[PDB]
From a paper:
The organic anion transporting polypeptides OATP1B1 and OATP1B3 are membrane proteins that mediate uptake of drugs into the liver for subsequent conjugation and biliary excretion, a key step in drug elimination from the human body. Polymorphic variants of these transporters can cause reduced drug clearance and adverse drug effects such as statin-induced rhabdomyolysis, and co-administration of OATP substrates can lead to damaging drug-drug interaction. Here we present cryo-EM structures of human OATP1B1 and OATP1B3 bound to synthetic Fab fragments and in functionally distinct states. Transport proteins of the major facilitator family, to which OATPs belong, are thought to operate by an alternating access mechanism.
Fab18 binds at the extracellular side of the transporter and interacts with a segment of ECL3 that is conserved in OATP1B3, explaining the cross-reactivity of this antibody fragment. The OATP1B1 structure revealed an inward-open conformation with a large, central cavity exposed to the hepatocyte cytosol. The cryo-EM sample of OATP1B1 contained E1S, and we observed a density consistent with a single molecule of E1S bound in a funnel-shaped cavity located approximately half-way across the membrane and in the C-bundle of the transporter. The side chains of Tyr422, Tyr425, Gln541, and Asn544 form hydrogen bonds with the sulfate group of E1S. Among these, Tyr422 forms a cation-π interaction with the guanidinium group of Arg633, which can indirectly stabilize the negatively charged sulfate group of E1S. The remainder of the binding pocket of OATP1B1 is lined with aromatic and hydrophobic residues that contribute to Van der Waals interactions with the sterol scaffold of E1S. Among these, Leu545 has previously been reported to modulate substrate specificity in human OATP1B136, which is in line with our structural observation. The shape and size of the binding pocket rationalize how OATP1B1 can recognize structurally distinct compounds that contain a negatively charged head group and a hydrophobic or aromatic body. However, there was no density that suggests bound bicarbonate, and the side chains involved in HCO3- binding in OATP1B3 adopt distinct conformations in OATP1B1. State I, represented by our E1S-bound OATP1B1 structure, features an inward-facing conformation and contains a substrate-filled, polyspecific binding pocket, allowing substrate release into the cytosol.
Numbering used by the authors:
A (entry chain H): 5 to 132
B (entry chain A): 26 to 81, 95 to 123, 168 to 200, 207 to 280, 339 to 447, 454 to 487, 519 to 559, 569 to 646
C (entry chain L): 1 to 107
The structure:
Amino acid sequence: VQLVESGGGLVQPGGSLRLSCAASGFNFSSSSIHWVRQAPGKGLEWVASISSSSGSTSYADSVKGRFTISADTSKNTAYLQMNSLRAEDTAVYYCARYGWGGPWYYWLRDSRSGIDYWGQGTLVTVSS
Amino acid sequence: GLKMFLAALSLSFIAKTLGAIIMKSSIIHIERRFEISSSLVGFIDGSFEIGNLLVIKLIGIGCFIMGIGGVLTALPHFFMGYYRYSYMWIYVFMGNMLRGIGETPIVPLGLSYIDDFALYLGILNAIAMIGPIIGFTLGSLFSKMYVDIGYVDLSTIRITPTDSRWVGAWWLNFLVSGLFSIISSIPFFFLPVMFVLLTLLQVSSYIGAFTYVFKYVEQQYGQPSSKANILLGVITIPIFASGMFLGGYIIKKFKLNTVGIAKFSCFTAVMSLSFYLLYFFILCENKSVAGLTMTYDGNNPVPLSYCNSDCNCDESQWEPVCGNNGITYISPCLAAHLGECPRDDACTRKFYFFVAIQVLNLFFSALGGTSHVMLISLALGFHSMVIRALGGILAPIYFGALIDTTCIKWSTNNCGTRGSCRTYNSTSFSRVYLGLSSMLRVSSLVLYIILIYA
Amino acid sequence: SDIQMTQSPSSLSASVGDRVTITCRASQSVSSAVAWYQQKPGKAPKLLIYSASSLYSGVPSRFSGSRSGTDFTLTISSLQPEDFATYYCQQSSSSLITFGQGTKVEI
Ligand SMILES: CC(C)CCC[C@@H](C)[C@H]1CC[C@H]2[C@@H]3CC=C4C[C@@H](OC(=O)CCC(=O)O)CC[C@]4(C)[C@H]3CC[C@]12C
Ligand SMILES: C[C@]12CC[C@H]3c4ccc(OS(=O)(=O)O)cc4CC[C@@H]3[C@@H]1CCC2=O
């Protein structure tokens, strides 16, 4: 129904940071939360994922490792803790849910594709 | 080495004992989607006796035919539009009739081949009553889901099961039933005067009352389909089995050769009516639905409201609200929140008394339910055929007629309202339902008295 | 895997009520799991189509997506004043997502 992200600022080059996303209205456990980025005036890109209560960490072949994606299932929160955002991570990060797929009688042949709900996001730009 | 054959016929009997338990639970859900009056759900139900009358190894083929009938019973849902949040129920009817066909050579040929080759009826009917509780629990689990699941996001649904318009997934009940029938057909393809009246005037009551028990427990007491389903499944069916066993245990306990069984039938009927006339004193007072029983202001029984006489709202559509006082208005146009006003805790507590009385009634019936066949060769067949035909076809029809004579507000579908009833004036409901039931019971009782006298 | 996706057009000039044919191409491992999103300036993207055939409940019935070989396509049945934005074609498989450079329509 609503997914709100919080955290993010102007951390000097290097160091660490952490962003949180809170959401209620759907079972917060059974909703594969995803993080997606949009550089200033550019395309989009995928960052991480927490499929369920299970970690199932998966990342991006350009900024893999420096990020960690976790979740507080009791506190209904998704966490993304990042290390040493050098110059390319400046963007407007977005949380998202894999929305209810099409009619579940014949869309099991195709995997999950859609992304229903989006937060407004806030910049995590990084510079000197 | 006949035990495999015995298990085969057992799996065959499970399907037949599942069938009715499925249909009579689906009746309340398949009345609001096709938007048909409750006089035609009687005909849809009687179709299953129509087919059996028409048809009146080889014992196995009927199981596959029943699987076909159940799959055709659910097939309309796939090839059809959406139900808003037709002349199409024909398939359902046809489907049910198909079912009856399979039911013809299965039950008798079983015992027929059984007595020839190599108690058997005993163990068979012992393992028979399993399918009912399986089906009741499945119905309790499926009456929790929508009707067009797999095709709509359940969160976008606004109706709730306590609400009136809500309809569940009956097609899934029929689907699992037909698949079980198909599977149970798999092994057999590789395997090798006054008494008839007395009993009719009792069985008609039972079949009608089972066809409309959920309508009762949903409009006088506040109990949805799931609760009332699993409460009869967990409780009433094991006790029914206990009574059916105690019947044969009693026949041996005391020699009831001819006069004893007659006394016992009179006794079980009297105990039934004794524990069945108490539903009146558990009655909860009717709810207050303004504009249908009582006027918008003041307490009296179409004199439109003084407040609504000015407003140009539209009559004839059900989308209710619940005033803080405890009165439900037909739609926000005519006037707390969306829904209705549930009854006080009093009725929610009285429901358990209803459950206990129902358990005791079914119990005191189950004792003579088995002795009946002991009391009465071709005459057995004639009595069986007559009760089946007349009761099955005719009971839901006349029950639905009268229950339709008490329905305050209806629905409109492009013409000819004939829409599924969406609110019942509950006191008239109690009067008609319990009155027909009780008058029929006493009409059977006086015949019992005459018989035991003669 | 190594699933990529390319998007040939970059500035279209369709007029009102036309049949623009925005077409992305699957570089590797055609997955039949595409999804087409729409984004206006300074807002958050919405879902137009998913799995290249179905729609999102609420979206006008104009938009038609289709699948042919290895080049999915999106045809706007007839443009309207509330449609000129950026369109993205995303591909997803077994917890790996990839995006596209976006077609930007104009007049
Ligand atoms: C014509 C003959 C060959 C019979 C064909 C039968 C199939 C059409 C049936 C058998 C199993 C059925 C499925 C069994 C269980 C489900 C789950 C049921 O619930 C969900 O998927 C949950 C959705 C949610 O939680 O949001 C939706 C329908 C579906 C896919 C059913 C769709 C119809 C299926 C595939
Ligand atoms: C026990 C039973 C389940 C439902 C039963 C029922 C439920 C309400 C009812 O209504 S009542 O007015 O008698 O309370 C009557 C009956 C009569 C018997 C009927 C079935 C026989 C086979 C079976 O599995």
